[PDB]
C-alpha cells in the first residue's frame, strides 16, 4: 500500500539489507524496533555466515567511521545477530514487513531484529572549536551487515553494508501549567517597579512548530523600553572526554515595540527555531549530519532523577529569553526573564501490492 | 676515482650514449640535470644529424613505450636536443663530467643536457595482478638518441638508443615535533578507559631505514591486550584514467606481548618496509621495474598547496598502524591509531680521468 522500503548493498553487490524506516522513534517507554531483512547470495563464500550488528557509541575527534580521526570512543549498546543461518532465535515473532519482504525477495532473504533499550541517547552530532579546541563528536547508531567466517576475523569493505540509522526522540504533550517567569526591577533613585512577565505553552516542542511567547510589561517607571528582544538558545554540555559547555541562539526577533512610562503593554511574539537559519553556526548539536536534508536541531535530553548524565555524552536543552532594552536619560539596562521548554521529534502519522524501494542514502 | 659511467650503444653500434648516472635526484627545489654525451661517427643513414630527446609520460596498459597495449598515455614532459651538428651555442654551459667525457673520447663526442623542471612525478610503476581489474601502469623518464635528417622522420630501431633513467625523490629530515597519535576507548558496561599512544622517531624516512614505533598503553579496564600488532601500509591512489585506491601492508610485527588488566605498558618497536620479501605480489607502487634489484618501494608523492593533484598519476603515501587486540578470558574489540610518515630515497654521495665504463643495464 504505497509503502517505502529503503535498501543498501555491499560494494560487490552480493549482500543487500532492507529497512522500513531510517529513523526509529523512542517513545519514552519503548523505541520502535529495528526490524529488517537481508538478502544473501550463498554462492559467494558459501560456508560463510551473514551477521548484522547494531553499534550505539559516543565518538569524538573526526566523527565518521575512520581511524585517522578518532580520539575517544565509548560503547553504549551492541547487539549481534546471526541472520543467514536462522539460528535458535530469541523467538520474539516476525513482523508484517519482514514476511512481506521474504514473501517478495525470496528464501535467500533472512530477517534480523534489534530492540533498542529505552533511556539511551538519541542520535546527535556537533562540530566544535570556535577559537579553542574541541573536535567533531556525536552519538551515532550504526547497523552493519557483513559476510564472515565468524565475528572474530575482521570485516572487509567488499561484503559489508554499513547503515547509519537514526533514533530520534518523541515525547507527548503534558498537562499542567505553561512555562511562566517574571521579574521586577527598581533602578537607582526611583523606587518605581518595572514588571516583566512572560509565558509559553509547556509542550511547545515539535520540530518546526512555532513558539508563542506572551509578554506583559507593567512599567510604572519613567524610563521607556526602546525595543524588546526575544530569542531561543540551545544549550549543549559535553560530559564525556573533553567536557565543554555551549549555548547558541537559534531564533530571534528584535521587536520595535516600546512600553511608555507609567503604562502597561501586552503582546504575543511568535518564534520558530530553524536549523536552516543556523547552518555552520559552528555546527553545534544537530540530530544528524549537516549535509542531509533530514537534519534538525537536536531534541532536548530527557533526564530523570538519578539517571546517569555522563553516559549521555551531550546534554541538549532549550530556553526562551525575553529582554527589555531601556536607555532612558543622558550603562543602559537589561530586564529579562527566560523560560525553558522541551523540543521533540514530531510523531509520525498514526492511522500485487504497492511497495516502493528507495536507497537508504539520505538527500 | 674509478669513475663509473654507464654506456649503451646502438643495436648496430654507430651510436653510443653515455651518462654519469642512471638515477637523478629530485631535491625539492631542482632536479639533477641529465648531463651526457653522444658518440657517433658521421657515416650512417641520415648524414645530417643525431638528436636526443627526454620524454616523461604516464602510461597505462603495459609499462614501456609500445603500440599494441598502450590504452592510455598522458604526456608530461618532452625535450628535444640536436646533439650533432651543434645547435646555437647558448646552452654551451658544460659540466665537469661532460668535459672529461669529450676529452677521454674522440672528437666524435657531443654532449647533451636535459633539465627536468621540479614538481614532476618521480618514477613509478604499479603492478595490478590477481586482485585487480587493471594492468601495468606507471611514469617513465625515457632518454632516446636517434639519427635523422628530419625529426619528423620515423625513428629507426636500427638507428635508436633508448634508455629508461629514473628520477628519484629526496626530502631532507626536518626536525620539530615527531609524529604522534593517540586514542581512548571505553567498552560496554564500564567507564574505565583503555588509552593507546604511539610515536615515530622521525617523519622523513629513507629506503632501508628502520622505523621506531614508541608505544604506550594505559589499560585502566578489566580487559587484557591479547596481542600488539604494528604494521606499515602503502596507499597508492591512481588519479589518471581508471582511478583506483590500492592498499598494501609492507611491514608487519604482531608481537605476543600482553597488557594485563589495570596495568600499563610501553615498548619501542622497530620494523622496516622492504618489498624484497616475495617481490611484492600485486598492487604495490614500486619506483622501478620489479625485475631490477635496483628498484625500491615507491617514494611518497610530495604534495603542495595549490598543487594540481591529478597530473601526478599515482598518489603514493604510507602510514604506520598500531593495533591493540583486546579480550578477557572465556566477539573481541580492537583499539588502534595510525601515523603517517614520508618514505624518501637516500642521497648517494656526500662522502687524469680513470673513467671506466659500465654497461648501462639495471641488474
Amino acid at each position: 500500500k504505497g509503502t517505502r522500503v529503503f535498501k543498501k548493498a555491499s560494494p560487490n553487490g552480493k549482500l543487500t539489507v532492507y529497512l522500513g524506516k531510517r529513523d526509529f522513534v523512542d517513545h519514552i517507554d519503548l523505541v520502535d524496533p529495528v526490524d529488517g531483512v537481508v538478502l544473501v547470495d550463498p554462492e559467494y563464500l558459501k560456508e560463510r555466515r551473514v551477521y548484522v550488528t547494531l553499534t550505539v557509541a559516543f565518538r569524538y575527534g573526526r566523527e565518521d567511521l575512520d581511524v585517522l580521526g578518532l580520539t575517544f570512543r565509548k560503547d553504549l549498546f551492541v547487539a549481534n545477530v546471526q541472520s543467514f543461518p536462522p539460528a535458535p532465535e530469541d523467538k520474539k515473532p516476525l513482523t508484517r514487513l519482514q514476511e512481506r519482504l521474504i514473501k517478495k525477495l525470496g528464501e535467500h532473504a533472512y530477517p534480523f531484529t534489534f530492540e533498542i533499550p529505552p533511556n539511551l541517547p538519541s542520535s546527535v552530532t556537533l562540530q566544535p572549536g570556535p577559537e579553542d579546541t574541541g573536535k567533531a563528536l556525536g552519538v551515532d547508531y550504526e547497523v552493519k551487515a557483513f559476510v564472515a567466517e565468524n565475528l572474530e576475523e575482521k570485516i572487509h569493505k567488499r561484503n559489508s553494508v554499513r547503515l547509519v540509522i537514526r533514533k530520534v526522540q518523541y515525547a507527548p504533550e503534558r498537562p499542567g501549567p505553561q512555562p511562566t517567569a517574571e521579574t521586577t526591577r527598581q533602578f537607582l533613585m526611583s523606587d518605581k517597579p518595572l514588571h516583566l512577565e512572560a509565558s509559553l505553552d509547556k509542550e511547545i516542542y515539535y520540530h518546526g512548530e512555532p513558539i508563542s511567547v506572551n509578554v506583559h510589561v507593567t512599567n510604572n517607571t519613567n524610563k521607556t523600553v526602546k525595543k524588546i528582544k526575544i530569542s531561543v538558545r540551545q544549550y549543549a554540555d559535553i560530559v564525556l572526554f573533553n567536557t565543554a559547555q555551549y549555548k547558541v541562539p537559534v531564533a530571534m526577533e528584535e521587536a520595535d515595540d516600546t512600553v511608555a512610562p507609567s503604562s502597561t503593554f501586552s503582546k504575543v511574539y511568535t518564534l520558530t527555531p530553524f536549523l536552516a537559519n543556523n547552518r555552520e553556526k559552528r555546527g553545534l548539536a544537530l540530530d544528524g549530519k549537516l549535509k542531509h536534508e533530514d537534519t534538525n536541531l537536536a531534541s532536548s535530553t530527557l533526564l530523570r532523577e538519578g539517571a546517569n548524565r555522563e553516559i549521555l555524552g551531550i546534554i541538549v536543552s532549550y530556553k526562551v529569553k525575553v529582554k527589555l532594552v531601556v536607555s532612558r536619560g543622558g550603562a543602559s539596562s537589561d530586564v529579562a526573564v527566560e523560560l525553558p521548554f522541551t523540543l521533540m521529534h514530531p510523531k509520525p502519522k498514526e492511522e500485487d501490492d504497492d511497495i516502493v524501494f528507495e536507497d537508504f542514502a539520505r538527500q | 676515482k674509478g669513475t663509473r659511467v654507464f654506456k649503451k650503444a646502438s643495436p648496430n653500434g654507430k651510436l653510443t650514449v653515455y651518462l654519469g648516472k642512471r638515477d637523478f635526484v629530485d631535491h625539492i627545489d631542482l632536479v639533477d640535470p641529465v648531463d651526457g654525451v653522444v658518440l657517433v661517427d658521421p657515416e650512417y643513414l641520415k648524414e645530417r644529424r643525431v638528436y636526443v630527446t627526454l620524454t616523461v609520460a604516464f602510461r597505462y596498459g603495459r609499462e614501456d613505450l609500445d603500440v599494441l597495449g598502450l590504452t592510455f598515455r598522458k604526456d608530461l614532459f618532452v625535450a628535444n636536443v640536436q646533439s650533432f651538428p651543434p645547435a646555437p651555442e647558448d646552452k654551451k654551459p658544460l659540466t665537469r663530467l661532460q668535459e672529461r667525457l669529450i676529452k677521454k673520447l674522440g672528437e666524435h663526442a657531443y654532449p647533451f643536457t636535459f633539465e627536468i623542471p621540479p614538481n614532476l612525478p618521480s618514477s613509478v610503476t604499479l603492478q595490478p595482478g590477481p586482485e585487480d581489474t587493471g594492468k601495468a601502469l606507471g611514469v617513465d623518464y625515457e632518454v632516446k638518441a636517434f639519427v635523422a635528417e628530419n625529426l619528423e622522420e620515423k625513428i629507426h630501431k636500427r638507428n635508436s638508443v633508448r634508455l629508461v633513467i629514473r628520477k628519484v625523490q629526496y626530502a631532507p629530515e626536518r626536525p620539530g615535533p615527531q609524529p604522534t597519535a593517540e586514542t581512548t576507548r571505553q567498552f560496554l558496561m564500564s567507564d574505565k578507559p583503555l588509552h593507546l599512544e604511539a610515536s615515530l622517531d622521525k617523519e622523513i624516512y629513507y629506503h632501508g631505514e628502520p622505523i621506531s614505533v614508541n608505544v604506550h598503553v594505559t589499560n585502566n579496564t578489566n580487559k587484557t591486550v591479547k596481542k600488539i600488532k604494528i604494521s606499515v601500509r602503502q596507499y597508492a591512489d591512481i588519479v589518471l584514467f581508471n582511478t583506483a585506491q590500492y592498499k598494501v601492508p609492507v611491514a608487519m610485527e604482531e608481537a605476543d606481548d600482553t597488557v594485563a588488566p589495570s596495568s600499563t605498558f610501553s615498548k619501542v618497536y622497530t620494523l622496516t618496509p622492504f618489498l624484497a620479501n616475495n617481490r611484492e605480489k600485486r598492487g604495490l607502487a614500486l619506483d622501478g621495474k620489479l625485475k631490477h634489484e635496483d628498484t625500491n618501494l615507491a617514494s611518497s608523492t610530495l604534495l603542495r598547496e595549490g598543487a594540481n593533484r591529478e597530473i601526478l598519476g599515482i598518489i603514493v603515501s604510507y602510514k604506520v598502524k598500531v593495533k591493540l587486540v583486546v579480550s578477557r578470558g572465556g566477539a573481541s574489540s580492537d583499539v588502534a591509531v595510525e601515523l603517517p610518515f614520508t618514505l624518501m630515497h637516500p642521497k648517494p654521495k656526500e662522502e687524469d680521468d680513470d673513467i671506466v665504463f659500465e654497461d648501462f643495464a639495471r641488474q
Binding site: 550488528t53 553499534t55 551492541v78 569493505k157 547509519v164 | 572465556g330 574489540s333 580492537d334
Partner: peptide
C-alpha cells in the same frame, strides 16, 4: 565476560 565488536569501515560518498 567480554564486550561487543569494534566495527571499522566507511560507506556513503562525498564529492
Amino acid at each position: 565476560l567480554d564486550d561487543g565488536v569494534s566495527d571499522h569501515s566507511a560507506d556513503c560518498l562525498d564529492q
